[PDB]
Paper text:
Crystals of LukE12–311 and LukD27–327 provided measureable X-ray diffraction data to 3.2 and 1.7 Å resolution, respectively. Each of the two crystal structures had one molecule in the asymmetric unit, and the two refined models included amino acids 30–311 of a total of 311 for LukE and amino acids 27–325 of a total of 327 for LukD. Furthermore, LukD–HlgB superimposition results in an r.m.s.d. of 0.97 Å. The phosphocholine-binding pocket that is occupied in HlgB by a molecule of MPD in the pore structure or by a molecule of phosphocholine in the structure of the water-soluble monomer is occupied by a molecule of bis-tris buffer in LukD. Since it has been shown that the core of the cap and the rim domains are rigid between the monomer and protomer in each member of γHL and that they conserve their relative orientation upon octamer assembly, the structures of LukE and LukD have been superimposed on HlgA and HlgB of the γHL pore complex (LukE, r.m.s.d. of 1.67 Å on 232 Cα atoms; LukD, r.m.s.d. of 1.66 Å on 246 Cα atoms). The superimposition of LukE and LukD on the HlgAB complex reveals conservation of the residues that are important in the electrostatic interaction of the protomers in the complex. In interface 1 of the cap domain, Asp44 and Asp48 of HlgB and Lys15 and Arg16 on HlgA are involved in the interprotomer electrostatic interaction. These residues are conserved and correspond to Asp69 and Asp73 of LukD and Lys43 and Arg44 of LukE. In addition, Asp66 of LukE and Asp69 of LukD seem to also be very important in stabilizing the stems in the soluble form. Indeed, they are involved in intra­protomer hydrogen-bond interactions with Tyr141 and Tyr142 in the stems in LukE and in LukD, respectively, as well as with the main chain of the stems, indicating the importance of these residues in the transition of the soluble monomers to the pore-complex state.
Leukotoxin ED (LukED) is one of these bicomponent pore-forming toxins that Staphylococcus aureus produces in order to suppress the ability of the host to contain the infection. The bicomponent pore-forming toxins have two separate water-soluble subunits, one of class S (related to the slow-eluted component of PVL) and one of class F (related to the fast-eluted component of PVL). The S subunit is typically involved in targeting the specific cell type via the interaction with surface receptors and in the recruitment of the other toxin subunits, leading to oligomerization and the formation of an octameric prepore. The prepore is composed of alternating S and F subunits and is able to assemble a β-barrel pore domain in the cell membrane, producing the mature pore that ultimately induces cell death by osmotic lysis.
Numbering used by the authors: 27 to 326
Write the structure that this text describes.
């Protein structure tokens, strides 16, 4: 159910006007949804258009509970890492100039408020504030849960692109750990989601139960990221923005070796990607969905 809202114009103050449009793009099979808020800013004091683009929506983990009847070997897939990127293309007058979060973050809840001030300055504050009808300045917020995970900014990031990774980082298993995607014990392997080393249960029932796993590992990730792009007002061409949501699905396994159990986590055994490409009209402050691309490296 693709949809783009009509442009809404709001005068922020005597110099600044906001033109807001939200675009939604989904892939029901992959359970990935992109909710993109395009906040176009026109500033009488400054010779560039600014776009504060908020990327929200949903990326399912792809987790499915293992079969409880799996006897001595079992496994499941889970959300090892979520990747989100925004890139500009088809117009050299457009550049990525700021973004949030700016820095590596392992807080359980990422909450920031990004503001615009005349002349193109961007400000950032921790926590959630503003964005009200009476607010005399423009702001937009990011708010997302990532307990046990860590946000990092992609290297690839430059003047045409910004990307983030939200990766399983410090996961506790009944007081033991923290474990990660590549933890190692010489006897027991990676105990990340192992139930018990000597359990008499079936393999399918010898994993850390679902509700004790991180929400991002077995449920969904609800991304909220901001990309700030500038566009020279001497340019009158449209441009394109490509937004990519991706999950790396890890395969966690257990096995009974006759003496004890062994766990292992296999990183990124299935990569699932959904990309939407929008045509941006900087004069009219409107967007149009060009296309979408969906991929799954190892479907099962």
């Amino acid at each position: 159910a693709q949809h783009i809202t009509p442009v809404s114009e709001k005068k922020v103050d005597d110099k600044i006007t906001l033109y807001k449009t939200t675009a939604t793009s989904d892939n029901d099979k992959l359970n990935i949804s992109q909710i993109l808020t395009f906040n176009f800013i026109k500033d009488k004091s400054y010779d560039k258009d600014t776009l504060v683009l908020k990327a929200a929506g949903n990326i399912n983990s792809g987790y499915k509970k293992p079969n409880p009847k799996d006897y001595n070997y079992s496994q499941f897939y889970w959300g090892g890492k979520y990747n989100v990127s925004v890139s500009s293309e088809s117009n050299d007058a457009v550049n990525v100039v700021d973004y949030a979060p700016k820095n590596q973050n392992e807080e359980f809840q990422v909450q920031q408020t990004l503001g615009y001030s005349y002349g193109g300055d961007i400000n950032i504050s921790n926590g959630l504030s503003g964005g009200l009808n009476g607010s005399k300045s423009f702001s937009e917020t990011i708010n997302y849960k990532q307990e046990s995970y860590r946000t990092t900014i992609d290297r690839k990031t430059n003047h045409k692109s910004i990307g983030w990774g939200v990766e399983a980082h410090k996961i506790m298993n009944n007081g033991w750990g923290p474990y990660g995607r590549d933890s190692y014990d010489p006897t027991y392997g990676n105990e990340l989601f192992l139930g018990g080393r000597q359990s008499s249960s079936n393999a399918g029932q010898n994993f850390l139960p679902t509700h004790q796993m991180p929400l991002l590992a077995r449920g969904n990730f609800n991304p909220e990221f901001i990309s700030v792009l500038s566009h020279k007002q001497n340019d009158t061409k449209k441009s394109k923005i490509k937004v990519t949501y991706q999950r790396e699905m890890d395969r966690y396994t257990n096995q009974w070796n006759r003496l004890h159990w062994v766990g292992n986590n296999y990183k990124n055994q299935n990569t699932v990607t959904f990309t939407s490409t929008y045509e941006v009209d900087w004069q009219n402050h409107t967007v149009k969905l060009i296309g979408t691309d969906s991929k799954e490296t190892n479907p099962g």
